[PDB]
Write a protein that binds this ligand. Structure first.
Ligand SMILES: *[C@@H]1O[C@H](CO)[C@@H](O)[C@H](O)[C@H]1NC(C)=O
Ligand SMILES: *[C@@H]1O[C@H](CO)[C@@H](O)[C@H](O)[C@H]1NC(C)=O
Ligand SMILES: *[C@@H]1O[C@H](CO)[C@@H](O)[C@H](O)[C@H]1NC(C)=O
Lengths: 157, 52
């Protein structure tokens, strides 16, 4: 967090819908970038997989409710997000509309994920509206496991 | 008989190549039939090399 975005502020991406201990906060594996000194310049970021395992990467895209918030937060009207790798490619554009409140919020955030194979690289490019990755996972596979749904208590068995 | 038709759409890596090969910036491809309809737009981005 403290060395990847010299331009852009990293300390103001909090909301009341994700409040913790009575104070506004945000997710802990993702980062909300904002304008610094009245500008939101283009960004480019690459990561090369050198962990000899698959890596799970997650990101998000923000859709505000009116053009005033878009102009005040990103200083742009036609923003784009591009995410590419060796066998993955996608482009995203924000949509501005008025929506019913869910947790007191009229905007939305869409969440995306991908798996990166060993020795591969992934590239992020953005004009605005990007919720950047902060933490990823290197996965190990096994046999005889799953997810079950229950309300039983834990015992010393 | 039924006929199988195949086509493709090219996505270059920089805007200079787009301008040099097609002399346009906002291109489109449209394919339609009686029960089929689609539109395609190229996307310009820098990507890792696969076969160079
Ligand atoms: C941040 O801005 C400086 C301008 O002094 C620029 O040199 C640098 O490349 C920018 N950061 C990135 C990641 O490009
Ligand atoms: C940021 O991206 C836009 C879009 O291509 C480009 O025109 C502009 O030159 C970029 N910024 C800089 C400082 O080059
Ligand atoms: C656990 O859920 C089952 C059905 O979902 C219910 O019958 C049972 O009362 C629940 N147990 C407790 C301790 O709430």
């Amino acid at each position: 967090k403290e060395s990847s975005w010299p331009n852009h502020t990293v300390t103001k991406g909090v909301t009341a819908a994700c409040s913790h201990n009575g104070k506004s906060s945000f997710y802990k594996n993702l980062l909300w970038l904002t304008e610094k000194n009245g500008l939101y310049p283009n960004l480019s970021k690459s990561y090369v997989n050198n962990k000899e395992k698959e890596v799970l990467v997650l990101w998000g895209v923000h859709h505000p409710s009116n053009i005033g918030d878009q102009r005040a937060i990103y200083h742009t009207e036609n923003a784009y997000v591009s995410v590419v790798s060796s066998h993955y490619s996608r482009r995203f554009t924000p949509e501005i509309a008025k929506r019913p409140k869910v947790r007191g919020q009229e905007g939305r955030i869409n969440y995306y994920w991908t798996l990166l194979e060993p020795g591969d690289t992934i590239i992020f490019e953005a004009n605005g509206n990007l919720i950047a990755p902060w933490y990823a996972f290197a996965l190990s596979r096994g046999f005889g496991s799953g997810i079950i749904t229950s309300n039983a208590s834990m015992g010393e068995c």
